[PDB]
Amino acid sequence: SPRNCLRFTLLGCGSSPGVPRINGDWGKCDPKNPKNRRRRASLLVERYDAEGNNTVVVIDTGPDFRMQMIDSGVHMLDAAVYTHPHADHIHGIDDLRTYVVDNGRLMDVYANRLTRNRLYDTFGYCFETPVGSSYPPILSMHDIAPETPFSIEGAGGAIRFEPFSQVHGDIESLGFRIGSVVYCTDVSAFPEQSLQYIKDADVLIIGALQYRPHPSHFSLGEALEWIEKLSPKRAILTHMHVPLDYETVMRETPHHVEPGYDGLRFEVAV
Amino acid sequence: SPRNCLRFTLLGCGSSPGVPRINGDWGKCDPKNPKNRRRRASLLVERYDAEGNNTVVVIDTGPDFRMQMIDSGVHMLDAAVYTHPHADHIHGIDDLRTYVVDNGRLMDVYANRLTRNRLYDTFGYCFETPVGSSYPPILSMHDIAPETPFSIEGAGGAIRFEPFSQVHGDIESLGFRIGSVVYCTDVSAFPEQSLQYIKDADVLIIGALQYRPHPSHFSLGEALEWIEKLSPKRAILTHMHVPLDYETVMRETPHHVEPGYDGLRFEVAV
Ligand SMILES: Nc1nc2c(ncn2[C@@H]2O[C@H](COP(=O)(O)O)[C@@H](O)[C@H]2O)c(=O)[nH]1
Ligand SMILES: Nc1nc2c(ncn2[C@@H]2O[C@H](COP(=O)(O)O)[C@@H](O)[C@H]2O)c(=O)[nH]1
Ligand SMILES: [K+]
Ligand SMILES: [K+]
Ligand SMILES: [Mn+2]
Ligand SMILES: [Mn+2]
Ligand SMILES: [Mn+2]
Ligand SMILES: [Mn+2]
Ligand code: NA
Ligand code: NA
Ligand code: NA
Ligand code: NA
């Protein structure tokens, strides 16, 4: 059992369609390597105390959320934190309702105004019962914004998040620093004011979509350039699409850089 | 390879939270029997011609849609048909976009007015590009209504659906007859005018949630009463929650009635 630590689980490391795509397309990925089967991008963040009590926070609830949590072996949840309101990050939100029953209280969710206002449009019934329904709401909303730290309380003690702005094509997404672990998915450029949060990480988890340029995400080469500038002790690539085969990318990257895989798990001091 | 037939695949046979729930709760289900692991409710309907060309239609696109299609081994899709606009039936809709690329045309979707109007609210970006986006739409909407047959064309020939009304607690859901296979999920009562569609089926796929009453779904005992009245040659139970263990329900039900399981597949003449 984990003790006196933060524990991170890469619940999903794929691009928006997953790997393979729904049509069975593996791209250039070796279909025989289980690490190439990729769920939609999400991170589990836990804090364990000396007795093994935990605070549990998920970053994003995409379509794979239920299976991600089942496979993680972690059976409770304190909060959900959102990066941005794209389908692959939000469409599993209904599956929070089991925890609301278990906890006896609304699920605390954290989102910027852009994200919150999109969640209210898509999923209003999770916040307020509509005309003609008897389903109670399930979520309690909290604002977050770049450069404003926030803390989530729970049984293992507080987990302090440091949000910051990312450019994501035509919209903004959030990245987060949690201690000296940084999570940067769905990012095509880093604004200058965000750099303080991303430099000198023990572990930088950074999106690298594919080899070729894309308007909304770093290419592998762009992510590697950022890794060189930001000097993380270790980097883990995420949000990886079907052109990026695990073994191939492992060989192509520096020793301290690896492609992620679903279920990748590590502990750090806190 | 299938030939000269309709082929049905029970893509999912669980209740809205799945089995187990996201918190690892199996209820009374034996966790060691793989048939108790249940995805959200969905049916694949195919028609094969003499040469093995197929028309492929899915009923509902819930959160498990991507994995359901991958595991089915069927790598193309002609249309999606919807029963009603609950989370467990619609929140996988974004994953249709791969097929739009493969087919070179918008995905044809079929829904009643209630369902369509909810899809436009939750998922408007799938129909019309919003302000501030460059993502093209992916869906082409078609109306369906009880007691009005409709046909979907494709490579294997047309598949004719006969929709009908079901009471589902405080809303209406659709059931469908396809030849002499009937699909009745998310139903708490059958209106009189729907009975002609549901009687004398070769296979009746009918929702049975749990043993105890529920406002929105038949209990096992209620579904069995309907099966006795409607005299299907075979019945398959679906939308089954955590109280309903596969082996137990198999023993408790008549010979011609079985609990479903994910991946249950059969062929019938057409
Ligand atoms: N919820 C939502 N998802 C969107 C919108 N526009 C595009 N998407 C979906 O968001 C995902 C974008 O993928 P990305 O490449 O940023 O990982 C795709 O699944 C795409 O179809 C939108 O306006 N709202
Ligand atoms: N999309 C949507 N889902 C709903 C609404 N109200 C409840 N739900 C969800 O729909 C499902 C209802 O489950 P059922 O028992 O009918 O299978 C649950 O996942 C529930 O949280 C709503 O207004 N819209
Ligand atoms: K490497
Ligand atoms: K039986
Ligand atoms: Mn994404
Ligand atoms: Mn995105
Ligand atoms: Mn349902
Ligand atoms: Mn329903
Ligand atoms: Na805990
Ligand atoms: Na770019
Ligand atoms: Na076909
Ligand atoms: Na009832």
Author numbering:
A (entry chain A), B (entry chain A): 3 to 272
Q: What does the literature reporting this entry say, word for word?
A:
Here, we report the high-resolution structure of BrabA.11339.a, a structural genomics target that entered the pipeline as a ‘β-lactamase-like protein’. β-Lactamases break down β-lactam antibiotics such as penicillin and lead to the resistance of pathogens to antibiotics. As a very typical feature of β-lactamase-like proteins and the phosphodiesterase protein family, a two-metal center is present in the active site of BrabA.11339.a. It therefore seems likely that BrabA.11339.a is a GTP/ATP or GDP/ADP hydrolase.
In fact, the high-resolution native data set was collected on a beamline which was optimized for data collection at the Se edge (0.9774 Å). In the native data set a partially occupied GMP could be identified. In the native structure, a partially occupied GMP molecule can be observed in the immediate proximity of the binuclear Mn2+ center. At no stage during the purification was GMP added to the protein; thus, it must have been copurified from the expression host. The two metals are 3.40 Å apart, bridged by water 330 and liganded by several histidine residues (His86, His88, His170 and His241) with bond distances between 2.22 and 2.24 Å, aspartate residues (Asp90 and Asp188) with bond distances between 2.28 and 2.31 Å and the phosphate group of GMP. The phosphate group is involved in hydrogen bonds to both manganese ions, the bridging water molecule 330 (called water 1 in the ligand-bound structures), histidine residues His88 and His241, aspartate residue Asp90 and further water molecules (315, 454 and 511 in the high-resolution structure). The structure of BrabA.11339.a and its binuclear manganese center were determined with high accuracy using high-resolution data and anomalous diffraction.
